[PDB]
Amino acid sequence: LTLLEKTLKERLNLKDAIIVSGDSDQSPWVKKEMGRAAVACMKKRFSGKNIVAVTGGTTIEAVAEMMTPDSKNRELLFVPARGGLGEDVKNQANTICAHMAEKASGTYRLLFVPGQLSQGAYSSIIEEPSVKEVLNTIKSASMLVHGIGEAKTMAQRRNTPLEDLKKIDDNDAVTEAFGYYFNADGEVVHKVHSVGMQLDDIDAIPDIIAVAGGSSKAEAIEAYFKKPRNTVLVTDEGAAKKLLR
Amino acid sequence: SNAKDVLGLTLLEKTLKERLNLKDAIIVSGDSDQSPWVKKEMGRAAVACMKKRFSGKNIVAVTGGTTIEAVAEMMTPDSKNRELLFVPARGGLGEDVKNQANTICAHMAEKASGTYRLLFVPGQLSQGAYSSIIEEPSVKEVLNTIKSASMLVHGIGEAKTMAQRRNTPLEDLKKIDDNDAVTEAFGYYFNADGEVVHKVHSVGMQLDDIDAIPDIIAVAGGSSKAEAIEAYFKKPRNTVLVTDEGAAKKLLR
Ligand SMILES: O=P(O)(O)OC[C@H]1O[C@](O)(COP(=O)(O)O)[C@@H](O)[C@@H]1O
Ligand SMILES: [Cl-]
Ligand SMILES: [Cl-]
Ligand SMILES: [Cl-]
Ligand SMILES: [Cl-]
Known about the structure:
The structure is a homodimer.
Chain A lengths: L1 H11 L3 E5 L8 H17 L3 E6 L3 H9 L8 E6 L12 H12 L2 E2 L10 H7 L3 H11 L3 E4 L2 E2 H7 L4 H9 L4 E3 L2 E3 L5 E4 L15 E5 L6 H7 L7 E5 H7 L2
Parallel strand pairs in A: 1-11, 2-3, 2-5, 3-4, 5-10, 10-11
Antiparallel strand pairs in A: 6-7, 7-8, 8-9
Helix pairs in contact in A: 2-3, 3-4, 9-10
The structure holds 1,6-di-O-phosphono-beta-D-fructofuranose (FBP) and chloride ion (4 copies).
């Protein structure tokens, strides 16, 4: 495995690779072990005060589940990286963020701005103090913890307008992260319009941890890391072994 | 039922149904204010009640609070494997929304091996912003599902206890006091005659909606809640109450 990690690192240009045992597509509990490893990676990188941006999805929900209070007692503020991506509440960044904060015995900020508001309603809402302040907090994140999905899988699960499904399909999206759909070369081919973190913003976040696994995600994971992301990947053998096959 | 004979529960249930306008009364032994395990027994009885009421397909609306949490903790899969979708009955708007019904909803659905849909948890926003959000198709779908609820399982609280437990605006605290609220259920505070005197700023189920819900199960007990329970049921609610001797004996004698 030491070798598997080193090879994955070089292939994907990662800051580091953390690989847990097994294939989460065959053994669901393996997702909880990715969660556990992610938490450990987070705690390695915390400073005295931390603003942690987090996405939704079931894998970051596993991070939240495995979260425990910080032993050194460092200060932790969690914020949802970006909302209004059309997920059911169980899968919203806003939900996962609150859950993680609770488990870490930290604090969190709520941010709910849904996907399909009118131009006027969207323009007005993002100027409201509670939103404006949280957007600023997200802008100054010291950490980002995010998932990676297959494009088709994400597009189906979310409430995706028909015209956008077409675009995602016609532009050969294969992977998705934080509301960006990318093709096989790591290029953006569809951006979901939503407030909060933008792709350009991630270069300003010193510690980024991606958490994604399962053999079925091998292609999505490879595609996402086709460009430099300055990111630590937590994955499992299922994804890593299939990617490197 | 030697048991419920000797413990006097069957006779107590009869009288409680005659006194309040109950669809049915289910009373477990003891006083949950004195004996915390009695809450777990209310949860047990409530779960059994739900299972007797389920149709082929169900949309079960739930409230938060420790009593419905105990219902969720006691929930087990349906041996008949009927279709079970759980939703929160309401969601909060305004400052520091916690949406604890969401918490209980997910917990109960997981225990039942059912499915669930939660309500959004907003930050502090203008009414205009809330009005825009409510019409958003994804949000609208959940509200429509709550509107189609086949069952409602809810707590009942003392008005003062709840207004104080919650992040209640000072203007609304004054209103609740000045209008002599004595009881609370699902985001509505009622006076001693069971009339609404204040409604929490929320989305989801409204009091007028409960008539259309075939099965409503209130779960609330302890001597401290006798006055609140009596007040809530001063008006007809077509509701099955699961409670304890603590509440029932104090109310009746
Ligand atoms: O069962 P408990 O702990 O006495 O709580 C009962 C109360 O909890 C609730 O069900 C839910 O409280 P919230 O609406 O603040 O989340 C109230 O409607 C009810 O008054
Ligand atoms: Cl495995
Ligand atoms: Cl463990
Ligand atoms: Cl979302
Ligand atoms: Cl949900």
